[PDB]
Design a protein around this ligand. Structure first.
Ligand code: NI
Length: 341
């Protein structure tokens, strides 16, 4: 059944709750972003109102074939009334089109639902600065102090420098980047830009990217693989067997592959810096795991929450085990006692 952490009290609303059939008493289904664990269950047969960003609404229409009459896109940073309740969508700094949602309940309670987010100090100067938030539905993916990672900017600088050096030493090297969802587009776009190439990909992935309102996108991507020296492949194909295979397909146009796997966190984060990362190599193939995250680090999460000073925190991630739930509740109390709210 629909878990309590997907329901917004005092409303008929639910958040990211499309896989339970009809939820009894739901008058509006919000969708924070187009990732499959969140939209799971949506299709062309859905006949309830879906509230979301413009970009998520482009993906619902074009990729899932949800009918236009049930898609209600809202602008960001704008007070909107939905079924009698004032709401605001804020950028979540996750993937394209991802939002946080502010609900202003008739009784005076204010609720923030972060969806999936990567906390940033810039959020401290959004419409959130303007009133008190009583309850926080929090993306707790990385809520443990071991989870450190570099800035997105640091990681992109590493990738750009690595790729440019490799291709300038060997003009017959191919760059490949893995993907299995929207998000992390800066990785492959920044590398293709430094190399003066467009990125080449499948027709399915090109169609996905043409939904994202990225400026000048026609200048940056293509379905013509042969004209491109940055290829995108399914993340599943980013291994020695899949890459050797792919290289056969290019007809001796290339003699070397340099590949990127943008992971979340991986335990080499606890020891090594970005400047010191090394690839796995077999023959003429090298695979780099780079820690490009679209979720808050522990310290970014902690800073956001100590700034916001909520009265109550409801985790939405890692809620399935008693050990995880207890661990998280201990950190929340530490933060509250340190900051004095
Ligand atoms: Ni997500």
């Amino acid at each position: 059944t629909c878990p309590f952490y997907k329901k917004i009290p005092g409303t008929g609303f639910t958040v990211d709750a499309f896989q339970y059939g009809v939820v009894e008493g739901c008058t509006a289904y919000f969708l924070t972003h187009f990732h499959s664990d969140h939209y799971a269950g949506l299709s062309k047969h859905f006949t309830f109102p879906v509230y979301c960003s413009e970009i998520t609404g482009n993906l619902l229409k074009n990729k899932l074939h949800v009918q236009e009459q049930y898609i209600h896109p809202l602008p960001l940073d704008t007070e909107c009334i939905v079924n009698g309740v004032k709401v605001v969508l804020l950028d979540a700094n996750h993937c394209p089109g991802a939002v946080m949602i502010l609900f202003y309940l008739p009784n005076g309670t204010v609720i923030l639902h972060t969806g999936d987010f990567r906390a940033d100090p810039s959020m401290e100067r959004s419409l959130l600065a303007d009133q008190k938030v009583h309850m926080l539905y929090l993306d707790t993916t990385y809520c443990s102090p071991e989870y450190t990672f570099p800035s997105q900017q640091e990681v992109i600088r590493f990738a750009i420098n690595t790729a440019f050096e490799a291709v300038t030493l060997n003009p017959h090297a191919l760059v490949v980047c893995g993907t299995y969802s929207i998000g992390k587009e800066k990785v492959f776009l920044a590398i293709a830009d430094v190399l003066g190439s467009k990125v080449g990909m499948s027709q399915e992935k090109y169609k996905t990217l043409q939904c994202l309102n990225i400026p000048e996108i026609n200048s940056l991507i293509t379905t013509d693989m042969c004209s491109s020296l940055v290829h995108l492949l399914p993340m599943m194909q980013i291994n020695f067997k899949g890459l050797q295979s792919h290289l056969k397909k290019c007809g001796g146009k290339y003699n070397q592959i340099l590949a990127f796997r943008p992971t979340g966190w991986t335990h080499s984060n606890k020891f090594t810096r970005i400047a010191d990362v090394i690839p796995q190599t077999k023959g003429n193939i090298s695979i780099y795991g780079i820690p490009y995250s679209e979720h808050s680090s522990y310290l970014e999460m902690k800073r956001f929450v100590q700034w916001l000073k909520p009265q109550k925190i409801i985790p939405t991630v890692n809620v399935g085990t008693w050990k995880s739930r207890s661990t998280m509740e201990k950190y929340f109390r530490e933060w509250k006692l340190e900051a004095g709210y």
